[PDB]
Amino acid sequence: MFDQLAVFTPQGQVLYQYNCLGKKFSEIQINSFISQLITSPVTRKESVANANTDGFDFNLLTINFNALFYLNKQPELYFVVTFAEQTLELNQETQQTLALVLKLWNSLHLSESILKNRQGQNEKNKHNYVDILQGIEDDLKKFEQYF
Amino acid sequence: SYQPSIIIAGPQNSGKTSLLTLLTTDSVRPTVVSQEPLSAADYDGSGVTLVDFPGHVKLRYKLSDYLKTRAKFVKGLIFMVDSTVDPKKLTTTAEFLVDILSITESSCENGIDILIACNKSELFTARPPSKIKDALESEIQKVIERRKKSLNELDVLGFKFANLEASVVAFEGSINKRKISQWREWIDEKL
Ligand SMILES: Nc1nc2c(ncn2[C@@H]2O[C@H](COP(=O)(O)OP(=O)(O)OP(=O)(O)O)[C@@H](O)[C@H]2O)c(=O)[nH]1
Numbered sequence: 123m124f125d126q127l128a129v130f131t132p133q134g135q136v137l138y139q140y141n142c143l144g145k146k147f148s149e150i151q152i153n154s155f156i157s158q159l160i161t162s163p164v165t166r167k168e169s170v171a172n173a174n175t176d177g178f179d180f181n182l183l184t185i186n187f188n189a190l191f192y193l194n195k196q197p198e199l200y201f202v203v204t205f206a207e208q209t210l211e212l213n214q215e216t217q218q219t220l221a222l223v224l225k226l227w228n229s230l231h232l233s234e235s236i237l238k239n240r241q242g243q244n245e246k247n248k249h250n251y252v253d254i255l256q257g258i259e260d261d262l263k264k265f266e267q268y269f
Numbered sequence: 270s271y272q273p274s275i276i277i278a279g280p281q282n283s284g285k286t287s288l289l290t291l292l293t294t295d296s297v298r299p300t301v302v303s304q305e306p307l308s309a310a311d312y313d314g315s316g317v318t319l320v321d322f323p324g325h326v327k328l329r330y331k332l333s334d335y336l337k338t339r340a341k342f343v344k345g346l347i348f349m350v351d352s353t354v355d356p357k358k359l360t361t362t363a364e365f366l367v368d369i370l371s372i373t374e375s376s377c378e379n380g381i382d383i384l385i386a387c388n389k390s391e392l393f394t395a396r397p398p399s400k401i402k403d404a405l406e407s408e409i410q411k412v413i414e415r416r417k418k419s420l421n422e423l424d425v426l427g428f429k430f431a432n433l434e435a436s437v438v439a440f441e442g443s444i445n446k447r448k449i450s451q452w453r454e455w456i457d458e459k460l
């Protein structure tokens with residue numbers, strides 16, 4: 123089993139979070155990952171692209187737990203799976219879990235919707251603002267409901 | 270020319286992304302550590318942009334670069350802190366604030382007005398805003414003396430907030446309890 127799943131923007135706004143043991147979600151764990159990533163940017167050594175990733179490129183860090191993540195480009199989004207000490211079996215489970223999440227995300231055209239909602243005035247709220255949860259609320263609850 | 274703007278800055282964990290989220294959506298939502306700035310252009314139709322800058326030491330240059338290009342168009346800066354931090358442990362926070370003031374006071378004729386936004390007011394160990402401000406002022410004097418003694422081994426600025434050209438006010442708030450009326454009045458003055 124893995125520990126947590128999180129989807130968030132480079133600005134720190136959270137689109138989705140999941141804790142496997144039903145426990146209160148730990149922002150502290152995700153924040154220790156992010157702050158490590160800022161301090162130590164990735165190199166070739168952290169790269170993971172194999173059959174278990176469905177041809178997506180991931181990166182894997184150890185925070186002294188493990189964090190396997192994908193950085194989507196359009197729009198800019200982090201998808202991260204956390205877990206315990208590495209084994210053969212757990213690096214497979216996590217890698218297949220993340221590739222699955224992305225395929226399911228992309229099947230629900232969530233990335234495309236976010237980009238569309240940013241265009242023009244039609245989705246602006248009463249503060250003249252485009253809220254990233256604007257008009258993807260129903261697609262997100264469907265993403266929820268496959269977990 | 271640039272669009273007028275108001276800047277939200279300060280240490281990690283203070284509540285900057287939380288405030289911009291509340292101001293723009295009327296809701297309190299989960300956040301994590303920021304790696305890039307968050308902007309709201311033409312806020313409430315006023316022509317003014319609100320921008321939240323990451324607080325991580327290694328990303329401070331984003332705010333410095335923005336002030337070098339745009340300081341003449343900035344209407345105010347909000348310096349946010351977690352009110353529960355021990356007021357005898359403010360060195361890193363005071364270094365950040367004095368580094369901001371060196372730029373704001375020197376890049377404009379009358380400086381840039383500062384709100385010290387003392388967040389998390391509902392927590393038991395939250396300290397009063399006038400005590401935080403007095404503690405920061407004291408620690409900034411110590412930072413300046415340390416830097417002067419090292420240089421023998423900030424001329425635009427002992428140190429007192431009152432002697433700055435810009436105004437500096439400190440008010441409590443709570444984002445989680447939706448209790449930020451004095452901050453919203455200050456913003457409405459600068460818009
Ligand atoms: N108790 C309490 N916690 C708050 C309040 N406002 C924000 N927080 C919490 O403080 C933490 C940090 O808030 P953020 O907005 O992410 O902090 P930030 O200043 O943007 O931090 P960086 O992005 O790292 O620079 C989060 O866990 C928030 O939920 C508040 O009024 N009271």
Ligand SMILES: [Mg+2]
Nearest residue numbers: 134286302303
């Ligand atoms: Mg932030």
Ligand SMILES: [Mg+2]
Nearest residue numbers: 431432433434
């Ligand atoms: Mg004065």
